Design an enzyme around this catalytic site. Structure first.
Site, PDB file in Angstrom:
ATOM      1  CG  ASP A 130      -1.677   1.245   1.505  1.00 54.73           C
ATOM      2  OD1 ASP A 130      -1.612   2.202   0.710  1.00 54.73           O
ATOM      3  OD2 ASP A 130      -2.341   1.309   2.561  1.00 54.73           O
TER       4      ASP A 130
HETATM    5  C1  LIG Z   1       1.912  12.812  17.410  1.00 55.27           C
HETATM    6  C2  LIG Z   1       1.563  14.011  16.530  1.00 55.27           C
HETATM    7  C3  LIG Z   1       0.051  14.234  16.290  1.00 55.27           C
HETATM    8  C4  LIG Z   1      -0.685  13.049  15.606  1.00 55.27           C
HETATM    9  C5  LIG Z   1      -2.226  13.205  15.419  1.00 55.27           C
HETATM   10  C6  LIG Z   1      -2.783  13.027  13.964  1.00 55.27           C
HETATM   11  C7  LIG Z   1      -4.072  12.136  13.822  1.00 55.27           C
HETATM   12  C8  LIG Z   1      -4.236  11.326  12.485  1.00 55.27           C
HETATM   13  C9  LIG Z   1      -5.306  10.188  12.471  1.00 55.27           C
HETATM   14  C10 LIG Z   1      -6.544  10.481  11.567  1.00 55.27           C
HETATM   15  C11 LIG Z   1      -7.147   9.286  10.778  1.00 55.27           C
HETATM   16  C12 LIG Z   1      -7.031   9.338   9.245  1.00 55.27           C
HETATM   17  O1  LIG Z   1      -6.414   8.504   8.639  1.00 55.27           O
HETATM   18  S1  LIG Z   1      -7.869  10.686   8.299  1.00 55.27           S
HETATM   19  C13 LIG Z   1      -8.986   9.987   6.950  1.00 55.27           C
HETATM   20  C14 LIG Z   1      -8.677  10.533   5.532  1.00 55.27           C
HETATM   21  N1  LIG Z   1      -9.426   9.897   4.433  1.00 55.27           N
HETATM   22  C15 LIG Z   1      -9.195   8.606   3.951  1.00 55.27           C
HETATM   23  O2  LIG Z   1      -8.299   7.939   4.470  1.00 55.27           O
HETATM   24  C16 LIG Z   1     -10.049   8.066   2.802  1.00 55.27           C
HETATM   25  C17 LIG Z   1      -9.328   7.115   1.815  1.00 55.27           C
HETATM   26  N2  LIG Z   1      -7.953   6.823   2.235  1.00 55.27           N
HETATM   27  C18 LIG Z   1      -6.838   7.074   1.411  1.00 55.27           C
HETATM   28  O3  LIG Z   1      -7.078   7.558   0.311  1.00 55.27           O
HETATM   29  C19 LIG Z   1      -5.389   6.760   1.886  1.00 55.27           C
HETATM   30  O4  LIG Z   1      -4.606   7.424   0.954  1.00 55.27           O
HETATM   31  C20 LIG Z   1      -5.006   5.255   1.838  1.00 55.27           C
HETATM   32  C21 LIG Z   1      -6.013   4.459   1.009  1.00 55.27           C
HETATM   33  C22 LIG Z   1      -4.959   4.750   3.271  1.00 55.27           C
HETATM   34  C23 LIG Z   1      -3.560   5.052   1.170  1.00 55.27           C
HETATM   35  O5  LIG Z   1      -3.630   5.310  -0.127  1.00 55.27           O
HETATM   36  P1  LIG Z   1      -2.378   4.678  -1.304  1.00 55.27           P
HETATM   37  O6  LIG Z   1      -2.920   3.289  -1.505  1.00 55.27           O
HETATM   38  O7  LIG Z   1      -2.540   5.654  -2.446  1.00 55.27           O
HETATM   39  O8  LIG Z   1      -1.102   4.802  -0.502  1.00 55.27           O
END
Ligand SMILES: CCCCCCCCCCCC(=O)SCCNC(=O)CCNC(=O)[C@H](O)C(C)(C)COP(=O)(O)O
Ligand SMILES: CCCCCCCCCCCCCCCCCC(=O)OC[C@H](COP(=O)([O-])OCC(O)COP(=O)([O-])OC[C@@H](COC(=O)CCCCCCCCCCCCCCCCC)OC(=O)CCCCCCCCCCCCCCCCC)OC(=O)CCCCCCCCCCCCCCCCC
Ligand SMILES: CCCCCCCCCCCCCCCCCC(=O)OC[C@H](COP(=O)([O-])OCC(O)COP(=O)([O-])OC[C@@H](COC(=O)CCCCCCCCCCCCCCCCC)OC(=O)CCCCCCCCCCCCCCCCC)OC(=O)CCCCCCCCCCCCCCCCC
Ligand SMILES: CCCCCCCCCCCCCCCCC[C@@H](O)O[C@H](CO[C@H](O)CCCCCCCCCCCCCCC)COP(=O)(O)OCC[N+](C)(C)C
Ligand SMILES: CCCCCCCCCCCCCCCCC[C@@H](O)O[C@H](CO[C@H](O)CCCCCCCCCCCCCCC)COP(=O)(O)OCC[N+](C)(C)C
Ligand SMILES: CCCCCCCC/C=C\CCCCCCCC(=O)OC[C@H](COP(=O)(O)OCCN)OC(=O)CCCCCCC/C=C\CCCCCCCC
Ligand SMILES: CCCCCCCC/C=C\CCCCCCCC(=O)OC[C@H](COP(=O)(O)OCCN)OC(=O)CCCCCCC/C=C\CCCCCCCC
Ligand SMILES: CCCCCCCC/C=C\CCCCCCCC(=O)O[C@H](COC(=O)CCCCCCC/C=C/CCCCCCCC)COP(=O)(O)OCCN
Lengths: 459, 52, 178, 64, 103, 603, 88
Positions: free
Chosen positions: G43
């Site tokens: 991924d």
């Molecule tokens: C310690 C410092 C602070 C930390 C706090 C930060 C908190 C972050 C946690 C929030 C949760 C989330 O993921 S926020 C949610 C954002 N939206 C989505 O994840 C929808 C679809 N996902 C994608 O498109 C991704 O890219 C993916 C398929 C995984 C890879 O893609 P590839 O296949 O192109 O690599």
């Protein structure tokens, strides 16, 4: 005094009877010899003066200015040799003639036992400078600059003439010795107030005073390198010399009348030092620095104490040398980049290391690093002002801080950082430019060994 | 090599000269925004964001 | 650095950049490697639970709460690689970088030393002189009308061609010239 | 929910906390595309004049 | 995602050119062609040219020129304690008042 | 003939010979750094002689050798003061500089301009000796500005780096803020005492007023990085590690303190200035230790330690104990210079890595740096019978046994505890745990230059306190009797600092993560002082410098008043005068008018 | 410094070392030209983790714009060589 005046006059037929390709060599050699001869005026007395004749006299205030004037001409010729290459022999001879005439008028002005003769020569210096600015300047603003440099001056100088003749109609003489020996107090009257103003404003405009300084940035920016050198080094000091001479008849009215000019200078030094921090042009920054230094000299002359006068003399000499060096460095950059914009050519230390050393030493002397004569004059004036009033220390220290800030800002912007990529015409520094820089800077560090030569008649 | 038409000028009043000013500074008409027409001599010059 | 930028960042690129930033800042917080590995696996898990969301509005409401949380807990003194734009040796060796054209100003006595280097330099200069005339035409014919839309450059198409505008990329001074 | 960051003159808003980037529209996308077009045209002109072997001076900058 | 084919090809060509340039930056075994032309011992000579001569000059200058003028070198008037005798006069400073010595 | 003067001048004179040869052939070779190091070592072994002569007798001189300009009743001459402070500080500075140069021969080996770097170091040493031995205020000002210019040049050593230039200008700005007070004091002393020489200043000032002493305190606060003017010292870590170790660690930054030690006869006659100095030192040491206990750059931690020690020095000055402050200067030189030795060794071995989060197990990986750093930390925190003990313990006892602020005493004790805390922070995060550096290990201490340079200062940090304390004559009445707990207060607070900080550090191994508190953020961003005070004032200055001075007044209103008004009025008058249509009817009508008016008005 | 002048062989070996120490990839099927997305089924989160591992193992940072389009070990090696100016 004729043993200096006659050779300077003979510089003209020698220039006009020279070969087409020997004018610079002959002019430089004989101007250097005239400087060496004039160097023997420094043997001054603890008593009155060197009264050569009824027309000319020398003083330990006049002698350093005379020597600096004679020393400036060879440097001006060396600086002018480059950008006048593509020009006809007659026009180059005319340019050298203008420089020689300026030197002759300045030499006769600084001795000038008569006040009317002093005024005549002090205004005769106007013509060569105006011709140099409006003939051999580059931009289209030069004409406008010339107009300013003209009318401001005359706007101050025409009343003075009236005052001068008025004095001779009452006193009976305008000889400086007779004036000094027969001086009398000025009563607090409206007529005396206006006589004071007519005597002061002409020299105030050419320092220049803070409110009356508009002509200086234009005139210094649009002038060629020799014009800028002579404007900053010698022509600005005519006002200080005239004030130092003329304040002998203005007592005790100076005590009251000095306040507006003292406030103008003390606030304008801060204003112009702050202006230097935000400047997109090197020449304009150097011009505003000159305005700040001359504001300090104005304060010194207005306080009229022995330490004030010594500091003012030292600062005038040191500023002349330092500002001429700074203008020469800026012009060396300009003749390569043709822009005169400070932010354009960057990181020149990596390409011109010796020129970077020259930049550093010039910034250090402008910054008034001890034991330079710049700091000697600065400190003497500051101590005199502190005795005058303890609150001047805030303004003086703020001016020192801002001066260091803008000097190092100028050094860091042009010499440090990364070189500009698209500029590929930065050629190695010529021997002429390095020799010019050394001939500016060694006299300063060598004068710090014998300060009494430039501390004036009250030492 | 810069001509007179490529230099900063007076404050633009009509959208036509506004578009001309935006074209002069190599930026979009929608993004072009001069300084407010006050006594200051800003004239015709873009007011870019105050970011460092 | 090398790659030309786009007009915008897509949602996936934003999520991946947030992932990298959060992991680096968590490493700054979690100094030890075992603690960092544990918390980084937890962090990856917390990203993964919304990997399959189909609603773009939901996904955009996410990443926003996430970047707000990041800005709240972002370790105001993160670890920076020494050569990175915030590092302690970022532009240390820029003062040693001298352009190649400066060698054209060397005195003949200076070029008497290193004769092979200057012969090869002359060869390179000749190659540049010819390749430039080819490159201008190739770029003029390949650019779309109305000007370029993206600052990406084409490669060479023919046998003897060189990539357009190659001289100042090939002749970089060095990473550490001295 | 976490405490909110309040931007100021000398501490501006972060790019990742800007609501405008999260509010996308076709007009916004075309604006970004044409901003990139202007930047690319300027970059192409600069590099064409910069890589030229015949050029032996300062590249004039109208913006400066 | 990833490189487009044109990006791969341009990067590869630029890479080959850059590596050939970098290889050409190397020096041949004769490359620094130097033009030759002229017209305890180390410690012993160092301690003479850098210690002995300066101290000789400074001692001469201080003893014969600086000390020539008054008040140029001013000392401390060394401390005098009871029981001391003075070289110039020879008299002996009297002792103290025989305080009780116990513990 | 009484070699005291000749030798004490020969030291400073032979320090200048390599500067003379900086244009010779040796400056173009690779033997120049070794030449400079050998010259400095010879200067040290020659300056050991006046130290012995003073220790035997207490010998004192003023050497006014060259008479420079005379100003009516004021005479300015090149005069050197060769008192206890000068003859004691010169050998210490020369020893530290010798170690620094030997270390730099290894640390800066890859620098293309190493001869220049060595030349710069010698110039700083010369200016510092000029500052230390000056007998009048003008000479001391020469040294004051010379060390500042050398600091500006050496901080911005890598002039292609923007941050180095910014830090150098920052140092210049803060030192000019101090220079304001320096110049104020000089002007006051000239106007009131008619002298800049120290002898006349002491003779004519039996009860010194507030202005000269406040100016002196402002200059000292500027140059020693006190709380108002502190950030430039941590910002100065941009320069190479030898520069940080020599200038901004042990020699240059004590100069301000030295100034207040040089004017101590006037300080003891003023009561308010002593209180100001005490409070400034207390707040400085507390704030800087608080900032230190949370930093991640090792050089930043050591710089904040230096600032805290300077604050402690001025606390000692404020409790009217100047000789004790001088002794602390001498001891701090040794152990803080060695601390930067160890930091630079670690940085060089780990490929220019300065963050302690990437420095792991180095206790065994590099053992000589480990033992030198342990010894230096022990000397710094205060360990009985080491070099730092003979100063710091007496400092604490004197502060407890004095009529002082309660708050200043509390803050001094807390600063001691926090000193122990940041020392254990450095040791724990740099030497104890598992390695955290990149896999390719290039760790190496086996170079005789580094080993010898570190070990000389190590022997210093072990024995110099004992030797110097037992060799100098007593200059104050001691505190012979104390409460049993109040004699132990320094050791108690130091051990509490170790224990609490070590326990809090051991919790980083726990598999638990929480977000930081407000106090942690305040400590990490340096009380937010560098942010606000480097954004609000500067902007509000620069903006005005363009909006009001440059544009509103100079380019608009000064033009509007004198020249533009004149041009407009003359323009309008010329238009009115020269606009006649050429009809002689109007002309002769005006002639009749003027003629009629003329006859009537006059008569 | 005393840092050895690393070569292409060393960079390739070290990149493959880091990749074989990633247990989501079987080392025997790994090759220099194997794609991350399709030849190994990783991924994009795995790809950014691999970039972070390369950064931490070579001691320097790859910017996001360049890192997000590095999909083969060979082109990772090429990027590192171009950044560090490796001859052979
Ligand atoms: C310690 C410092 C602070 C930390 C706090 C930060 C908190 C972050 C946690 C929030 C949760 C989330 O993921 S926020 C949610 C954002 N939206 C989505 O994840 C929808 C679809 N996902 C994608 O498109 C991704 O890219 C993916 C398929 C995984 C890879 O893609 P590839 O296949 O192109 O690599
Ligand atoms: C300190 C004692 C020195 C004793 C030795 C004698 C030295 C004589 C020097 C005379 C003046 C120098 C001439 C100026 C132009 C420089 C020429 C040049 O280009 O160099 C080429 C040459 C070859 O180098 P290169 O590799 O070919 O060029 C590469 C680049 O140029 C890169 O080159 P770089 O990176 O190496 O930089 C060049 C260098 C040189 O460039 C400079 O900046 C020099 C000018 C600095 C002064 C700035 C003005 C401020 C006012 C000070 C006035 C002092 C003058 C005193 C009287 C002098 C008489 C003429 O600049 C510096 O290194 C910065 C030094 C900053 C010093 C600031 C401290 C000032 C006050 C010190 C005390 C003075 C009073 C003491 C009173 C008490 C004791 C008695 O380099 C040198 O030889 C270096 C010059 C010597 C360094 C000068 C530093 C101190 C000297 C101060 C003046 C004399 C002190 C008298 C007291 C004696 C006791
Ligand atoms: C009571 C004495 C204990 C002092 C407070 C220690 C403490 O609990 O701090 C953790 C605690 C929260 O730490 P955190 O926010 O989770 O830090 C995140 C990680 O620990 C991040 O940790 P890190 O590795 O990045 O940095 C560790 C640093 C970071 O921790 C800090 O933020 C330090 C800020 C407050 C400590 C300074 C006290 C003055 O903490 C320390 O280095 C140890 C703290 C100093 C304790 C040793 C000397 C203090 C005793 C002096 C008074 C008692 C003796 C009287 C002698 C007469 O700090 C507080 O709650 C503030 C309490 C007092 C504020 C007024
Ligand atoms: C490259 C690295 C360095 C290599 C070189 C190493 C050697 C350095 C030594 C030189 C600098 C160190 C300073 C030491 C100074 C020694 C000489 C000094 O003491 O002599 C001075 C003497 O020099 C003069 O005072 C200063 C020179 C005057 C300068 C005139 C300028 C030259 C004309 C140029 C045109 C003018 C342009 C500016 C217009 C104002 C002061 O002496 P003084 O105690 O007082 O009386 C002289 C002797 N008496 C007693 C018999 C009377
Ligand atoms: C613009 C850039 C700078 C240019 C130069 C600026 C410097 C010029 C400033 C002139 C110096 C002072 C001028 C007059 C000083 C006299 C003292 C006066 O200010 O105080 C009061 C004077 O009172 C009032 O001022 C009376 C005059 C009121 C009319 C003056 C106009 C006010 C503003 C004008 C300023 C414009 C300057 C530029 C003109 C073009 C005291 O009243 P009194 O004790 O009873 O009489 C004292 C005078 N005696 C003794 C001779 C009789
Ligand atoms: C060198 C190798 C040659 C060795 C042979 C010479 C041996 C020494 C013999 C020298 C003769 C004695 C001598 O020098 O004469 C005194 C003469 C002073 O002249 P006087 O007229 O007597 O008084 C000064 C005011 N007129 O002394 C000297 O000039 C030599 C030593 C001067 C002191 C050193 C100066 C170094 C610093 C330069 C000035 C720095 C700026 C000023 C700082 C101001 C500080 C307040
Ligand atoms: C009562 C009478 C007092 C007379 C005082 C005369 C002062 C000298 C300045 C007179 C200026 C008159 C000319 C004028 O203003 O015309 C506007 C003119 C139009 O440009 P032109 O050259 O004519 O055309 C070229 C392009 N086609 O504008 C200018 O160029 C102005 C440039 C010169 C400005 C110089 C300003 C000098 C004045 C400084 C302040 C002191 C003024 C003198 C009086 C002092 C107060 C007592
Ligand atoms: C940079 C541009 C500045 C322009 C000039 C600024 C200087 C202005 C100074 C006044 C100018 C003329 C003054 C007269 C010259 C001195 C002669 C004198 O002192 O004689 C007075 C004469 O005094 C006067 O006549 C003064 C009248 C002034 C009229 C012109 C006014 C000009 C503007 C006035 C306001 C501004 C004044 C200061 C401006 C400073 C520059 C900004 C007394 O003699 P008597 O009257 O014969 O004896 C007394 C018994 N009957």
């Amino acid at each position: 005094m004729l043993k200096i005046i006659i050779p300077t006059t003979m510089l003209l037929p020698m220039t006009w009877m020279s070969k087409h390709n020997m004018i610079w060599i002959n002019a430089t050699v004989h101007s250097l010899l005239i400087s060496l001869i004039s160097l023997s005026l420094l043997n001054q007395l603890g008593e009155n003066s060197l009264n050569f004749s009824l027309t000319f006299f020398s003083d330990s205030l006049s002698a350093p200015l005379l020597v600096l004037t004679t020393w400036l001409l060879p440097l001006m010729l060396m600086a002018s040799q480059s950008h006048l290459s593509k020009e006809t022999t007659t026009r180059k001879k005319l340019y050298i003639t203008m420089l020689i005439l300026l030197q002759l008028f300045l030499i006769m002005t600084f001795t000038a036992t008569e006040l009317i003769l002093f005024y005549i020569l002090f205004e005769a210096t106007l013509v060569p400078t105006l011709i140099i600015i409006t003939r051999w300047g580059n931009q289209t603003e030069r004409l406008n600059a010339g107009l300013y440099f003209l009318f401001y001056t005359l706007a101050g100088s025409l009343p003075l003439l009236v005052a001068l003749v008025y004095i001779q109609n009452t006193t009976g003489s305008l000889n400086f010795l007779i004036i000094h020996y027969w001086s009398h107090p000025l009563s607090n009257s409206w007529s005396n107030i206006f006589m004071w103003l007519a005597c002061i404003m002409a020299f105030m405009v050419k320092m220049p005073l803070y409110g009356l300084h508009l002509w200086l940035p234009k005139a210094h920016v649009e002038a060629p390198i020799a014009g800028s050198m002579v404007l900053a080094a010698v022509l600005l000091k005519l006002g200080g010399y005239g004030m130092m001479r003329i304040t002998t008849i203005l007592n005790p009215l100076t005590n009251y009348m000095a306040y507006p000019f003292l406030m103008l200078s003390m606030w304008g030094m801060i204003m112009t030092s702050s202006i230097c921090l935000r400047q997109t042009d090197l020449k304009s920054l150097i011009a505003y620095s000159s305005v700040s230094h001359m504001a300090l000299v104005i304060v010194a002359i207005m306080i009229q104490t022995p330490w004030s006068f010594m500091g003012a003399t030292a600062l005038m000499i040191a500023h002349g040398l330092t500002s001429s060096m700074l203008f020469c460095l800026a012009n060396t950059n300009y003749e390569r980049v043709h822009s005169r914009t400070m932010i354009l050519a960057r990181g020149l230390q990596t390409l011109l290391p010796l020129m970077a050393t020259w930049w550093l030493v010039a910034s250090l002397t402008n910054l008034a690093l001890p034991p330079s004569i710049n700091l000697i004059g600065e400190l003497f004036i500051i101590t005199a002002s502190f005795s005058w009033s303890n609150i001047t220390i805030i303004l003086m220290g703020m001016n020192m801080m801002i001066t260091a800030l803008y000097s190092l800002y100028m050094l860091i912007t042009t010499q440090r950082g990364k070189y500009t990529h698209h500029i590929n015409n930065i050629k190695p520094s010529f021997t002429r430019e390095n020799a010019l820089m050394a001939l500016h800077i060694l006299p300063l560090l060598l004068l710090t060994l014998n300060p009494k030569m430039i501390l004036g008649p009250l030492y | 090599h810069v001509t007179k038409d490529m230099f900063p000028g007076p404050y633009p009043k009509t959208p036509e000269e506004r578009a001309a000013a935006a074209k002069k500074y190599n930026m979009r008409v929608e993004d072009y925004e001069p300084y407010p027409d006050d006594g200051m001599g800003y004239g015709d010059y873009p007011k870019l964001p105050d970011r460092s | 650095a090398f790659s030309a930028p786009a007009a915008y960042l897509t949602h996936q690129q934003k999520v991946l950049r947030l992932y990298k930033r959060a992991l680096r800042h968590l490493e700054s917080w979690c100094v030890h490697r075992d603690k960092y590995r544990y918390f980084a696996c937890l962090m990856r898990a917390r990203f993964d639970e919304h990997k399959n969301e189909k609603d773009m509005v939901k996904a955009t409401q996410l990443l926003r709460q996430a970047e707000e949380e990041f800005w709240y807990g972002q370790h105001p003194q993160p670890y920076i690689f020494p050569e990175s734009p915030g590092g302690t040796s970022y532009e240390r060796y820029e003062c040693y970088k001298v352009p190649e054209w400066c060698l054209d100003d060397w005195h003949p006595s200076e070029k008497a030393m290193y004769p092979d280097y200057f012969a090869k330099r002359e060869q390179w200069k000749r190659l540049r002189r010819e390749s430039w005339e080819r490159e201008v035409k190739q770029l003029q014919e390949e650019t779309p009308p109305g000007g370029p839309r993206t600052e990406a450059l084409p490669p060479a198409r023919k046998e003897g061609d060189l990539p357009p505008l190659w001289w100042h990329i090939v002749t970089r001074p060095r990473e550490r010239p001295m | 929910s976490f405490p909110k960051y309040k931007p100021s003159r000398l501490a501006t808003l972060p790019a990742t906390l800007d609501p405008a980037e999260y509010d996308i529209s076709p007009e916004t996308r075309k604006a970004q595309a044409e901003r990139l077009a202007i930047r690319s045209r300027l970059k192409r002109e600069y590099l064409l004049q910069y890589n030229d072997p015949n050029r032996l001076g300062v590249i004039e900058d109208p913006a400066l | 995602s990833g490189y487009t084919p044109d990006e791969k090809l341009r990067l590869q060509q630029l890479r080959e050119l850059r590596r050939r340039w970098l290889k050409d930056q190397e020096l041949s075994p004769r490359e620094p062609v130097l033009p030759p032309r002229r017209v305890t011992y180390r410690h012993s000579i160092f301690a003479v040219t850098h210690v002995l001569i300066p101290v000789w000059i400074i001692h001469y200058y201080l003893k014969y020129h600086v000390t020539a003028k008054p008040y140029t070198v001013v000392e401390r008037k060394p401390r005098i304690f009871p029981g001391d005798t003075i070289l110039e006069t020879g008299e002996v400073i009297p002792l103290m008042k025989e305080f009780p010595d116990q513990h | 003939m009484n070699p005291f003067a000749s030798l004490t001048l020969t030291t400073l004179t032979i320090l200048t010979i390599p500067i003379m040869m900086s244009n010779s052939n040796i400056y173009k070779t690779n033997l120049y750094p070794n030449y400079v190091k050998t010259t400095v070592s010879y200067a040290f072994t020659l300056s050991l002689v006046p130290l012995l002569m003073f220790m035997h007798t207490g010998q004192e001189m003023i050497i006014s050798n060259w008479h420079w300009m005379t100003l009516q009743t004021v005479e300015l001459s090149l005069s050197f003061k060769m008192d206890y402070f000068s003859v004691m500080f010169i050998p210490v500075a020369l020893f530290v500089t010798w170690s620094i140069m030997e270390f730099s021969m290894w640390y800066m080996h890859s620098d293309p301009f190493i001869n220049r770097f060595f030349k710069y170091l010698l110039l700083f040493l010369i200016t510092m000796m000029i500052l230390v031995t000056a007998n009048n205020l003008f000479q001391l000002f020469i040294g004051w500005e010379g060390v500042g210019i050398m600091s500006f040049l050496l901080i911005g050593w890598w002039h292609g780096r923007t941050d180095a230039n910014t830090a150098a200008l920052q140092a210049i700005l803060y030192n000019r803020i101090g220079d304001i007070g320096f110049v104020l004091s000089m002007a006051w002393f000239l106007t009131h005492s008619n002298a800049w020489d120290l002898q006349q200043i002491f003779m004519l000032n039996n009860e010194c007023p507030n202005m000269p002493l406040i100016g002196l305190l402002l200059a000292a606060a500027g140059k020693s990085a006190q709380f108002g003017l502190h950030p430039w010292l941590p910002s100065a870590m941009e320069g190479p590690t030898p520069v940080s170790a020599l200038l901004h660690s042990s020699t240059m930054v004590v100069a301000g303190v030295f100034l207040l030690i040089r004017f101590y006869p006037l300080m003891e006659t003023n009561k308010l200035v002593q209180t100001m100095t005490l409070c400034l030192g207390a707040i400085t040491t507390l704030f800087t230790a608080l900032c230190a206990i949370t930093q991640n750059d090792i050089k930043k931690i050591v710089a904040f330690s230096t600032s805290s020690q300077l604050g402690l020095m001025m606390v000692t000055i404020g409790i009217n104990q100047p000789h004790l402050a001088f002794l602390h200067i001498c001891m701090h030189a040794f152990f803080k210079a060695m601390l930067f030795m160890c930091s630079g060794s670690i940085i060089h071995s780990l490929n220019d890595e300065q963050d302690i989060r990437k420095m792991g197990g180095l206790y065994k990986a590099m053992p000589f740096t480990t033992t030198a750093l342990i010894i230096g930390s022990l000397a710094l925190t205060g360990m009985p019978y080491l070099t730092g003990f003979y100063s710091k313990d007496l400092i604490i006892e004197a502060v407890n046994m004095s009529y002082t602020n309660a708050w200043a005493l509390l803050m001094t004790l807390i600063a001691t505890s926090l000193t122990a805390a940041y020392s254990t922070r450095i040791i724990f995060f740099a030497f104890l745990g598992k390695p955290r550096f990149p896999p390719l290990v290039l760790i190496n201490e086996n170079n005789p230059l580094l080993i010898n340079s570190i070990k000389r200062l190590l022997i210093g940090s072990i024995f110099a306190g004992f030797i110097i304390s037992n060799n100098i004559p007593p200059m104050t009445v001691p505190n012979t009797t104390m409460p049993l707990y109040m004699k132990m207060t320094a050791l108690i607070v130091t051990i509490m600092g170790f224990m609490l900080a070590l326990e809090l550090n051991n919790t980083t191994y726990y598999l638990k993560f929480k977000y930081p508190s407000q106090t942690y953020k305040f400590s990490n961003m340096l009380g937010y002082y560098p942010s606000i005070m480097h954004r609000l004032p500067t902007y509000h200055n620069l903006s005005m410098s363009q909006k009001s001075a440059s544009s509103l007044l100079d380019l608009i209103w000064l033009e509007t008043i004198l020249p533009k008004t004149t041009s407009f009025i003359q323009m309008k008058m010329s238009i009115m005068v020269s606009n006649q249509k050429g009809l002689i009817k109007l002309y002769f009508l005006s002639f009749l008018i003027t003629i009629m008016i003329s006859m009537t008005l006059f008569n | 410094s005393d840092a050895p002048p690393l070569t292409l062989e060393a960079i390739k070996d070290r990149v493959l070392y880091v990749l074989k120490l990633y247990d989501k990839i079987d080392p025997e099927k790994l090759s220099v030209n194997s794609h991350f997305m399709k030849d190994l089924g990783l991924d994009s989160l795995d790809q950014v983790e691999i970039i972070m591992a390369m950064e931490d193992e070579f001691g320097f940072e790859i910017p996001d714009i360049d890192a997000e389009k590095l999909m083969c070990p060979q082109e990772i090696v090429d990027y590192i060589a171009d950044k560090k100016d490796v001859y052979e």
